Amino acid sequence: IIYDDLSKQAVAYRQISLLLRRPPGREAFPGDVFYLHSRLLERAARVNAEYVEAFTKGEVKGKTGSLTALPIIETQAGDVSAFVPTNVISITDGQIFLETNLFNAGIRPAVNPGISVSRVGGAAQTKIMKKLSGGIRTALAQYRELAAFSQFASDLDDATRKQLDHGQKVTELLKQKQYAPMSVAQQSLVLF
Amino acid sequence: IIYDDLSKQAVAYRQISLLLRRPPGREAFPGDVFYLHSRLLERAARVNAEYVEAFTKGEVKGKT
Amino acid sequence: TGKIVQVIGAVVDVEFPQDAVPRVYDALEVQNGNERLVLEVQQQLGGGIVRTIAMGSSDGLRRGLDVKDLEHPIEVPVGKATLGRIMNVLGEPVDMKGEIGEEERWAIHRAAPSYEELSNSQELLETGIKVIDLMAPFAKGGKVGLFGGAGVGKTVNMMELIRNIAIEHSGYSVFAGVGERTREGNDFYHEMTDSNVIDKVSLVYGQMNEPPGNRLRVALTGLTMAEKFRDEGRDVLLFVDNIYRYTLAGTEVSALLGRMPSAVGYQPTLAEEMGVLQERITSTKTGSITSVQAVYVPADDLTDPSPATTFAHLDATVVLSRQIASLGIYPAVDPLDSTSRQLDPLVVGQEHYDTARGVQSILQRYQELKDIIAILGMDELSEEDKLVVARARKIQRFLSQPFFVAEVFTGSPGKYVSLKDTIRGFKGIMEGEYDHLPEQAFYMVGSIEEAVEKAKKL
Amino acid sequence: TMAEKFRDEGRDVLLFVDNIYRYTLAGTEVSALLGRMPSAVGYQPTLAEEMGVLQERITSTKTGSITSVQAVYVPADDLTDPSPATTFAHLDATVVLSRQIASLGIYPAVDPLDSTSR
Amino acid sequence: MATGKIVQVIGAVVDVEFPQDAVPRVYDALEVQNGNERLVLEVQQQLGGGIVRTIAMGSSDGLRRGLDVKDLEHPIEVPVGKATLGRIMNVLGEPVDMKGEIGEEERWAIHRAAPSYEELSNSQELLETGIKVIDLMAPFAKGGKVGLFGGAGVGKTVNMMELIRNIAIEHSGYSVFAGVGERTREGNDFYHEMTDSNVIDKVSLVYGQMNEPPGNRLRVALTGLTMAEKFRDEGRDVLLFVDNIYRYTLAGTEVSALLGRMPSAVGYQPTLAEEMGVLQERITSTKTGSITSVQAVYVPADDLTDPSPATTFAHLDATVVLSRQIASLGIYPAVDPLDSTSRQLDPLVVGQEHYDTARGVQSILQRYQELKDIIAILGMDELSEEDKLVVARARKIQRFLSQPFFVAEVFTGSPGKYVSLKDTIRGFKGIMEGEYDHLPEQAFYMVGSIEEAVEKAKKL
Amino acid sequence: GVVENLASEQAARMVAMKAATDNGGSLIKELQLVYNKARQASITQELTEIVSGAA
Numbered sequence A: 001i002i003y004d005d006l007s008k009q010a011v012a013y014r015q016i017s018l019l020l021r022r023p024p025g026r027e028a029f030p031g032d033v034f035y036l037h038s039r040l041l042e043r044a045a046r047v048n049a050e051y052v053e054a055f056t057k058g059e060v061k062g063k064t065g066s067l068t069a070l071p072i073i074e075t076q077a078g079d080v081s082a083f084v085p086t087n088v089i090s091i092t093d094g095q096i097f098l099e100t101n102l103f104n105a106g107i108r109p110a111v112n113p114g115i116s117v118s119r120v121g122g123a124a125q126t127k128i129m130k131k132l133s134g135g136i137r138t139a140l141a142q143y144r145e146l147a148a149f150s151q152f153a154s155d156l157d158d159a160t161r162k163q164l165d166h167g168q169k170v171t172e173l174l175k176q177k178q179y180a181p182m183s184v185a186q187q188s189l190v191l192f
Numbered sequence B: 001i002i003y004d005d006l007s008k009q010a011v012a013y014r015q016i017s018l019l020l021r022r023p024p025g026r027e028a029f030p031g032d033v034f035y036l037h038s039r040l041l042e043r044a045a046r047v048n049a050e051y052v053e054a055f056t057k058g059e060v061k062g063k064t
Numbered sequence C: 001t002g003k004i005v006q007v008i009g010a011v012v013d014v015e016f017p018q019d020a021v022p023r024v025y026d027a028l029e030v031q032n033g034n035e036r037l038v039l040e041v042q043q044q045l046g047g048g049i050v051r052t053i054a055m056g057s058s059d060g061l062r063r064g065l066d067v068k069d070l071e072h073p074i075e076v077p078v079g080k081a082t083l084g085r086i087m088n089v090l091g092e093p094v095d096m097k098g099e100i101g102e103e104e105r106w107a108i109h110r111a112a113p114s115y116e117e118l119s120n121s122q123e124l125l126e127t128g129i130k131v132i133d134l135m136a137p138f139a140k141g142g143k144v145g146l147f148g149g150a151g152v153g154k155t156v157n158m159m160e161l162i163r164n165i166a167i168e169h170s171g172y173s174v175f176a177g178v179g180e181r182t183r184e185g186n187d188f189y190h191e192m193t194d195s196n197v198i199d200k201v202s203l204v205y206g207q208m209n210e211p212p213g214n215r216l217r218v219a220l221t222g223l224t225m226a227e228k229f230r231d232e233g234r235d236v237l238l239f240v241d242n243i244y245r246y247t248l249a250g251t252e253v254s255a256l257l258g259r260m261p262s263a264v265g266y267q268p269t270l271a272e273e274m275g276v277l278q279e280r281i282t283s284t285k286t287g288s289i290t291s292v293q294a295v296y297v298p299a300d301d302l303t304d305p306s307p308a309t310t311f312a313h314l315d316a317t318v319v320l321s322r323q324i325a326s327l328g329i330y331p332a333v334d335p336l337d338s339t340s341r342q343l344d345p346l347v348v349g350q351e352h353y354d355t356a357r358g359v360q361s362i363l364q365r366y367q368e369l370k371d372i373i374a375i376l377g378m379d380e381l382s383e384e385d386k387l388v389v390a391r392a393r394k395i396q397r398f399l400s401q402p403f404f405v406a407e408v409f410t411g412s413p414g415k416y417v418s419l420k421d422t423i424r425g426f427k428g429i430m431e432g433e434y435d436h437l438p439e440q441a442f443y444m445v446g447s448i449e450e451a452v453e454k455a456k457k458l
Numbered sequence D: 001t002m003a004e005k006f007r008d009e010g011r012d013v014l015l016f017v018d019n020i021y022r023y024t025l026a027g028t029e030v031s032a033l034l035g036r037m038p039s040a041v042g043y044q045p046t047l048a049e050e051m052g053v054l055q056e057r058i059t060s061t062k063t064g065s066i067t068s069v070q071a072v073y074v075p076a077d078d079l080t081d082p083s084p085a086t087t088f089a090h091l092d093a094t095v096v097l098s099r100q101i102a103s104l105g106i107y108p109a110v111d112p113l114d115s116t117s118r
Numbered sequence E: 001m002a003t004g005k006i007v008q009v010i011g012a013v014v015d016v017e018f019p020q021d022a023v024p025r026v027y028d029a030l031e032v033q034n035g036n037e038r039l040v041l042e043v044q045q046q047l048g049g050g051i052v053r054t055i056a057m058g059s060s061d062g063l064r065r066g067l068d069v070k071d072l073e074h075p076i077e078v079p080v081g082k083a084t085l086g087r088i089m090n091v092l093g094e095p096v097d098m099k100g101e102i103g104e105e106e107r108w109a110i111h112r113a114a115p116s117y118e119e120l121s122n123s124q125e126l127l128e129t130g131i132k133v134i135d136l137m138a139p140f141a142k143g144g145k146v147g148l149f150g151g152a153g154v155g156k157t158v159n160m161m162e163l164i165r166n167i168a169i170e171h172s173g174y175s176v177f178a179g180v181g182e183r184t185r186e187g188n189d190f191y192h193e194m195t196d197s198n199v200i201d202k203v204s205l206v207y208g209q210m211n212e213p214p215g216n217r218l219r220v221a222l223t224g225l226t227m228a229e230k231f232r233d234e235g236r237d238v239l240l241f242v243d244n245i246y247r248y249t250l251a252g253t254e255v256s257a258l259l260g261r262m263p264s265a266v267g268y269q270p271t272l273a274e275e276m277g278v279l280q281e282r283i284t285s286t287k288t289g290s291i292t293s294v295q296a297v298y299v300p301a302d303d304l305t306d307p308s309p310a311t312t313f314a315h316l317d318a319t320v321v322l323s324r325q326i327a328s329l330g331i332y333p334a335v336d337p338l339d340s341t342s343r344q345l346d347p348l349v350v351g352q353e354h355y356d357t358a359r360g361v362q363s364i365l366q367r368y369q370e371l372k373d374i375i376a377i378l379g380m381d382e383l384s385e386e387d388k389l390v391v392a393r394a395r396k397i398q399r400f401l402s403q404p405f406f407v408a409e410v411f412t413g414s415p416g417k418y419v420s421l422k423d424t425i426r427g428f429k430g431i432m433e434g435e436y437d438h439l440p441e442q443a444f445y446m447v448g449s450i451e452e453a454v455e456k457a458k459k460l
Numbered sequence F: 001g002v003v004e005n006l007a008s009e010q011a012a013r014m015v016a017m018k019a020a021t022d023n024g025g026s027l028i029k030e031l032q033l034v035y036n037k038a039r040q041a042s043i044t045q046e047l048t049e050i051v052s053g054a055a
């Protein structure tokens, strides 16, 4: 399930609250907006096979059910410190951060690898991708640590110039066109 | 006509508005702080000769 | 059959018999001195009271006056008869000609077209403007918005678009002036009437002098005239001079209507007031409306709730900026913020798309260096990054263009640049084939030819 | 309460609180619902008093002892908004974890130069 | 006979209910017996139903409900005139020093209207303070406002004492010092620093300090001002010192919050500009006399845009900023010639010779300020010879801006000097026109006129 | 020639760093105006939210 702009649902609920004259909060949002998004997002769950059997009254045996949520939030000017983003960032199991500087510089998709997290991590990857992505993480980590010098690249020793030039290349490798999905074999091949 | 400070008119209107408990907006100025200056400055106009005739009951012809 | 019981600013409260209370959005009538004042009810308070907004000067109203309940909403002349004439928010003729010989009148409050009826169009529309139709091309039947602060060119750009697409266009056109200068309305009316195109344009004008209710409903009054031509099977052009005033008028009245303020003093119903309008200005299977909307952003803050909630309602968004206009670079479009739904390889071709994305990349790379250039000077930049800066500046200047409606300011004659002719010039500047030419060769020229020609004179 | 019951038997329990930040958010929500006038950054007025009512029962008495380990999310890494700002007054040690270290692969990801203890 | 009764008490805000036709008018004073001592309440608002809302000019603890309130039919009235010189008084004009009663004969209300349009002086004079730096780089208009943006440890109190002395001696004017909202320690040691320099008989002190309820800190400035106005009506030229106008703003903010009025620009009262204006618009030069004012200003958060400094600077004519540096070099007074400003420095008001002399010395010093950095980094002899002359003249000018005060004799031992304006203009034209290049810079230091710098160089 | 080029290198780095110090100084005086503007806006928005939320 994909919730497009839970940050417009928050605005509709703010309107409803302010018209019923309920006590306003921060940015005029009501108090129970965290309880509005929380009991929505805690429905996206994976259920064990015994719950599915009990629910379907024995019609379906030995199969787990699952529902995945991808709520979308819009931040004004990159301010993660607003009432709605600071709640949904705390409710969810991860955060994909899309940045406008990367989008403008040609890096599409524009995910920020260093500020995005998935708390499930390697458990949700095929073992080939779990094996291969470990080196991408560290390549981009060292590249983000050295990036400051990219403006003084000529001064650097060649022992780090190689790390910086490998980081730039793995960064250029993660760019991808729209409506062009890769099967897991192709992603693993390219990351290898 | 010269309005010596339409910045101090805005401040005096902000005072009068806040003393009446009217919800303020940006920089604590009221909502209609634009309308305040709008209905004022929109009077500085140039009018065609027909307006001058109709207004002055025909005493003044052709001038603007 | 009703009495006034309160007069707070622009809002009036009226008491009716319990069994005759008007409905929401019905129109009432009073006698304010010699004149007749039309009220539009907004709320049904309890006990027969009803709270309304005055479509006129509220001064002179006593308590206890007798108001008459007209049993229909506000209704405006509509159709072919309203063509080439100026009208109030109330549909009354405001030029000194006679009556509007209308055959039909429509209520200005209407439901948006059903999702089933919508239509989508990839047919590109071409304008004589380099930056607009390189960075943010827009298509027939789509929404366009010019975002900018105060005094940056978002009215001059709209008049240029009127010139370039509206005169070369068959169908009728509708121009709604919402809360802008009466001077500009007079100037536009006379420019039209002097070129005999007035008989294709319908004008509605609730300019900045008028009380909040006129500015509040004039936009709807214009959309109705537009919807009519749309449903007749035609295709229409709808120009709205400043849609920000439509919500500013709502903010001015909200607190008097007894509604708790919201984010920055805005009405609690900002997003719904804005959607309920912009959802009915659309093209459909039975006709299409092509609309250009100027959108003022207060205090140049592109994150204020009013522009932030408007961004979502437009297909092509052009963002003007003061930091460019202060460089003399007109139009002051900000190429790193303008976008269009129509900028896809499929829609505009691989060559156009690639040139646009290359320009964006170069300008952004130049932005990233602007602080190191500020602190350490330009001589510290690598030779590769000193080429990027010079090409970025050449591109900055080549996006400038002279307009036919701006001859009054600069004296230079305007230019009309075809798309084929501009993607070529930018491919050239980027690829380097013009990398030996002084920057000022690119300031205010139509096509790359004119720049290589201007370089001979320095 | 469960930890205090175990303490009163003479045991040395260890109490784990999975996030102080959400304890403060629950306090903020509950306070906004009751209509109390808000404080510095929307936080209830009684923020520091709720934090003290919690933290002042975790102590080693002469009969037993309750130790505590408490996770505390720092929103936007600012360390200065009232929740971590008000929790520091009670802690006896602070272990700071950095995502940069974790990304280089070395879990537990503790920063040794910013960690401290009284 | 008392007629009202206290009905509410909330902090410093007290509500009393009168008979329906005896409601006091705004700013009228009331009094109550707060136990064994009376307490004065000032009316701020009239609510409906005979209820009136007041602020207590004293600690409100101990007030019951239902206490009788007597309605004085006039605003707060204070003693004025010659009798108040050398005394110390609080907001209500009560002798706060222990030397007994004030022997005045006449009492004025503190709430008053500014001089009408056709009372103001139809001229524009200047005030000869007697200090070289001020008279040259930041002249005072007679009846204008002067901000004093110096910090601490720079001599603000001794500058104030020198102005008091000179304006009492070399003119025939008195002075009034209003202590709005500052430390008691400074008030006591100012009282002493003045009593041991014989200027105490030339100044009238009124003190409302940080340890006072908000009403006192609010109205003390009006008390000082309404004594200065009595001195004006006698035809004198008067000088009024305010210890901190920023605290006069903040006391009004506190009071406005107490009354529950909606906040405004950045936390301030909605009536900020009017509260500041109705004060600053009473110190002007009238056809009979004039009140000049020297006001210490404190800028919050180092921001000259904050509403309080922005509202104050609308009224200041001059501005003298004291500098720790200029003191460190040993030059006293410690005024900074490059940051001190005055809107009296125009040829059309001060004349062309004074204007261009001041602009000269300004350009000389502001070049020297960077030639000295070039020296600091590259060493002296890297300079050009033209620049060495610039440095050699700038050092002399910089020394000549010192002066010995009659008040500073107890530190310098040298007798104090009062330098007329003509003499400062002559000295600086000479030093800048290339005259006196033949005598050493220490011949100018702490001298006085240039005709004394020549004599000091003679014997050196 | 090598030694003279070295002395010129030092004399050029000196003026470059002087200009960079002056440009940083002239940039603080802009960042602080932006900072004060944001401080005032935050105070105003918070205090207005509280007051106009109550009652």
Ligand SMILES: Nc1ncnc2c1ncn2[C@@H]1O[C@H](COP(=O)(O)OP(=O)(O)O)[C@@H](O)[C@H]1O
Residues within 6 Å of the ligand: C148, C149, C150, C151, C152, C153, C154, C155, C156, C157, C330, C331, C401, C402, C403, C406, C409, C410
């Ligand atoms: N192409 C252009 N050439 C010259 N000046 C221009 C051009 N476009 C805009 N301007 C300038 O833009 C200024 C602002 O005008 P306008 O667009 O009406 O402001 P606003 O954005 O409020 O409508 C004009 O005075 C004009 O000089």
Ligand SMILES: Nc1ncnc2c1ncn2[C@@H]1O[C@H](COP(=O)(O)OP(=O)(O)O)[C@@H](O)[C@H]1O
Residues within 6 Å of the ligand: E151, E152, E153, E154, E155, E156, E157, E158, E159, E332, E333, E403, E404, E405, E408, E411, E412
């Ligand atoms: N004209 C002067 N002559 C000699 N010394 C002075 C003069 N002005 C100030 N000083 C010295 O500067 C010091 C600052 O003292 P003070 O005026 O009490 O501080 P502040 O002015 O900050 O209250 C004094 O100790 C005094 O000795």
Ligand SMILES: [Mg+2]
Residues within 6 Å of the ligand: C154, C155, C156
């Ligand atoms: Mg315009």
